[PDB]
């Protein structure tokens, strides 16, 4: 219930800091990180025997309401 005891993160308990300043009047921030993970298959056996990682495809989107300036 209280901030000092809740177990979960919420929109009201987080600040988004860019270049040492807080972002004002954001609406959402969402981040996708995909490793391109792929299994290694084989003749004679239908299932893959390990996964390997390809490219660190890492992104964050920021959506914000336009501050009158700044």
């Amino acid at each position: 219930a209280s901030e000092a005891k809740q177990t979960v993160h919420t929109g009201n308990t987080v600040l988004l800091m860019i270049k040492g300043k807080p972002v004002g009047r954001a609406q959402s921030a969402s981040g996708q990180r995909e490793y391109g993970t792929t299994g290694v298959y084989e003749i004679g056996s239908i299932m893959p025997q390990e996964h390997v990682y390809l490219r660190y495809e890492g992104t964050i989107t920021v959506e914000r309401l336009r501050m009158k300036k700044e």
Partner: peptide, 8 residues
């Protein structure tokens, strides 16, 4: 021949 596709 027997490629990766259609292993069996």
């Amino acid at each position: 021949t027997r490629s990766k596709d259609e292993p069996l």
